[PDB]
Symmetry: C2
Subunit: 533 residues, 2 copies
Amino acid sequence: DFAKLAAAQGDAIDSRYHPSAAVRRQLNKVFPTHWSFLLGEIALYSFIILLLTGVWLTLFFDPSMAHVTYDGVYQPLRGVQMSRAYETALDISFEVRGGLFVRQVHHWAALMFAASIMVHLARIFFTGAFRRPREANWVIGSLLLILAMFEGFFGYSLPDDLLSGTGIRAALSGITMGIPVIGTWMHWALFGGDFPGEILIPRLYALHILLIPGIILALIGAHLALVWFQKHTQFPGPGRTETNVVGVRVMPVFAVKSGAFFAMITGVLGLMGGLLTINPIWNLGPYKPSQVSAGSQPDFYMMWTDGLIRLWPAWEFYPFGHTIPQGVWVAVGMGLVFALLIAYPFIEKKVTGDDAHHNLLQRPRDVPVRTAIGSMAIALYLLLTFACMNDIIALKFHISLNATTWIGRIGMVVLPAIVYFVAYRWAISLQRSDREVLEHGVETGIIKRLPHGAYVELHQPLGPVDEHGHPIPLEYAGAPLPKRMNKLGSGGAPGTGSFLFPDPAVEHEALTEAAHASEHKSLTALKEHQDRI
Amino acid sequence: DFAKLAAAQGDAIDSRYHPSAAVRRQLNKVFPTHWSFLLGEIALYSFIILLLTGVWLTLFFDPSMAHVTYDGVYQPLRGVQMSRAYETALDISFEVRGGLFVRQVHHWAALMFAASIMVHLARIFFTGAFRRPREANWVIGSLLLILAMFEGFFGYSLPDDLLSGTGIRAALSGITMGIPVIGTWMHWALFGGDFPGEILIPRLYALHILLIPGIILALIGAHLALVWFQKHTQFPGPGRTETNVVGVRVMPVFAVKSGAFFAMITGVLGLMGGLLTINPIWNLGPYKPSQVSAGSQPDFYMMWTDGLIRLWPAWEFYPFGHTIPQGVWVAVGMGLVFALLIAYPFIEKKVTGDDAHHNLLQRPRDVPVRTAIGSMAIALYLLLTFACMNDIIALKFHISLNATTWIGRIGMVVLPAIVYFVAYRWAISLQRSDREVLEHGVETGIIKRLPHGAYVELHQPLGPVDEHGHPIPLEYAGAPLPKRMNKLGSGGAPGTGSFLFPDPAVEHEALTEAAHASEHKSLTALKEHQDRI
Ligand code: HEM
Ligand code: HEM
Ligand code: HEM
Ligand code: HEM
Ligand SMILES: CCCCCCCCCCCCCC(=O)O[C@H](COC(=O)CCCCCCCCCCC)COP(=O)(O)O
Ligand SMILES: CCCCCCCCCCCCCC(=O)O[C@H](COC(=O)CCCCCCCCCCC)COP(=O)(O)O
């Protein structure tokens, strides 16, 4: 029996560790099923894939700056002087079976990690999920985003190719040395001297494979533990209160959904690693300070910083025989941005005065000022990101490069103001669209002509009606309102069968009746539970 | 101020995370205070010091096998060809302020880590702490010891000096390639080809700073969590049962003792790091296959394996045009040893038939067969360890090297048998020594001549006496028995004061009376708890 072996192992485990009650508490934990609550899972799974592929990569990578002569299989670089880091990155992609695939899956997983962190942050901010008791966990997430940005930056610097080395010389070396008083000291502590030196790539490698990922893993553990023991927020809806969680238990539904989502995310990243080239370093050549190429963009999650460098004017100060160069603005700006991101929940509770416990989320339309502010911030982020690509955009879309930088310069002031105003009005406009349905019911789209010639649209009330037949106006409850009759079931269902052949009508009748009975029973269950609380 | 701040922060934490009950459960957890229960945390603290100093070391180490010419300050190696790994190990010890100290603290901490694991294992085995419900946690510890051995080996292989490279060529390369059918394939998977190659040191570096220490950290977490939630064993004693834990709560006594022990272990390892040279690699030179030195010992925790290689005879087989060389025996032997170590609790429950829950420890004298077996195993371990140093012993202690080989060969069979017999008889002899005190009381050492000329020693009974005055024989309770009258308080106390000047007599009287009252109250509390249960 497999049942007998399961019972025997269960009894052995329970007699040795008595975990029954704690395990059962974990099995009975309820998670809300909203689609947007799966956004953090994407970041977690990307991080796991990054760990697996990165461990595979460390078995082959030599991060040395020692200069060598290539002598590998890639003929266009035979005899070319390069570092050991560049040569072993080439050896991974040409001399190890599956190395190019693993490398591309790694770097795509890094892109998906950063992108899903950004999207998940947008959900947290716009729904108000950062509010108490949960602002520490917003802070932890903010730190996670900064660490992911710098981890990804250090990662693609490791191969010591021309493009990434150009990025290192300008950002890591150029901005650092420009910091007032202690800029050159920080530069010579980090590089061991002047750029490029001989220690940089081994040090970045140590930061990238162990130190930063260890901090990230610890912070992700704290983050998930806080979510787990603070009990995920939920949207307003039928039966949902400030004191309960509506959804599904872990066992089995949420566990199955999480595992299947992990498998599908892995599949997407594997398809991208196979089917799309990313960072083909053999085309770039080894890093040489005398060479450069057009189009020196960083990975996208760094582009905004680069975009800021491109847009800020050549404003410098020369006090008492010293120099404060342009880059000092960018560094300061970066700090300001990060400081505003970490501090946002406390800023908002100071401004709004709202310091209440919150477990029910806000729909973004219902908090028009915060939605406008977040839209303004996303507009600025997109403008800086595209300013970083201004040279590519100039080449491909026939815009003067000088024009692109002036468009970015005026835009970083003008576009966020326009976006703020539009987003504010749009949010209030959605509120009014909800009020219309609450007052009049759902517009069905059916127009009829009355005998005297009036044209009226048929409405479907969402609640009770009066003697005249008009609906009683309903109160907004923070939850979405239906606006299409088909979304209320008006379309029915086609005959059941395969796509090409119907099955017997008795089967169709039984199945349809069972489906309607089940739907009614679930609605009644939520309604009665709502009624008694 | 400082109290209102603590209350405010406590309320802020409790309103957001409601941790009061779980935290209080952690504060009230009771740990037994036995000195030998501190052996595991020496290993934990050594591991923590290893992590800190190792992170410091990765900021400077380049693990490349790329050959360069030494350009540093150490004049006796100027112009000498070496790997980048040997280069940067020299740069750490001469060109980074504090680098030699950090490196020596790292290596001493590794030695203390291995030695602590060994001594703690000896406690676990001899006291029976591995018995159910704790078999798994013995297995986890066994894996931890194997991983620590190989982690330390890889760590001292990283600098690529002559001594450690000689160790790599013989053990990692020679034994591996000797393996039947799959030997040479394993060698070429590990080295990327023939020894030495170009990938070995970067790969070992990746294993050493991230992969193996990550597995060790996960296993240590599981280990400590199992101890924490399975509730540490204890020795038999007054008030101790199979169902309770006697000792001190975490807050504050156990926390203070743990922190102070951590500080003292750190102090010892810091004194060793800057008072005793360990591994001065500049004296050894870079690794070259044409060179070797007398005295090729590994670190001590590997010596037994090396000792086995030295002692096993040149027995080889040559079946059908193939070769099974001598080293295969050693490989098999190692596996056997590890398999016997991991499997011991299940072996002993199969042999003894004892499958009961156990929370009370056994005194090693009371389990004479297991004590004899463990003594036999320690004798074999010491013989193999000293066989590894047989050449040093031959030079320093004037023994023929051939004679040391044969002493190790014969002693490998004879010494464990002698040690088993002696340890068995010695354990039973201690049992009889306990029985003597149980029937007759404590020999006080005072001899008295009776009027008719008899000589009698005065005894101190440990329980009630007869009308004749002889003690009633007491029953052994698995706990130690006093054997010195001074350990029962017969010596009194000197007299209160500084070392040179007495305190006022009234102070001395009050202090002595309070001390006696407190001791009596403590004894009475334990006694009445024992009487109740
Ligand atoms: C490595 C990056 C991150 C990972 C892997 C991650 C992962 C997750 C996951 C899985 C959840 C729970 C499921 C969900 O709501 O989506 C979650 C919740 C949360 N995350 Fe993140 N997160 C990251 C970064 C961030 C960031 C950038 C923020 C915001 C600054 C943030 C704030 C939160 C908050 C407040 C919650 C709880 C929300 C709630 O209950 O509804 N996290 N995170
Ligand atoms: C936050 C998680 C991580 C991110 C975002 C990340 C990102 C990156 C990026 C962008 C690169 C350059 C990729 C290129 O080849 O095209 C890279 C390279 C590399 N990463 Fe990671 N990485 C992460 C974690 C890890 C981890 C944990 C390891 C771990 C052991 C690792 C090992 C490597 C190695 C060896 C390389 C160099 C190999 C090569 O470039 O191809 N990475 N990483
Ligand atoms: C990295 C190596 C190890 C570390 C850091 C470690 C640490 C510790 C610590 C702190 C304890 C609790 C305190 C104590 O009794 O000393 C403990 C308990 C334990 N260890 Fe270890 N240990 C290691 C290896 C081992 C080994 C090699 C074994 C045996 C094969 C083992 C088996 C146990 C068992 C059975 C306990 C619980 C004993 C009891 O309750 O009395 N551990 N370990
Ligand atoms: C179980 C833990 C560890 C043990 C037993 C151990 C052991 C050793 C030993 C014996 C050495 C040779 C030291 C010497 O130069 O004389 C070494 C080198 C080294 N270890 Fe560790 N180690 C451990 C953990 C770590 C960790 C976690 C790191 C990384 C953070 C690390 C980083 C290094 C580095 C970079 C070297 C080479 C530099 C050098 O030799 O000086 N170690 N290790
Ligand atoms: C994880 C390794 C082993 C997994 C098997 C354990 C789960 C099945 C055992 C119990 C279910 C069947 C009924 C039964 O045997 O009842 C009992 C066994 O279960 C228990 O009482 C304790 C189980 C708790 C351990 C579970 C921890 C983690 C398991 C989750 C794995 C997904 C025995 O039935 P009986 O005594 O005959 O009435
Ligand atoms: C760890 C950061 C902050 C540490 C401060 C928290 C501990 C002190 C607060 C409570 C003790 C004093 C009495 C008091 O204020 O009573 C109350 C505060 O304590 C609580 O009720 C909750 C405390 C639980 C949090 C502790 C978790 C970790 C702390 C351990 C740190 C070693 C407030 O008293 P009151 O409401 O005025 O009756």
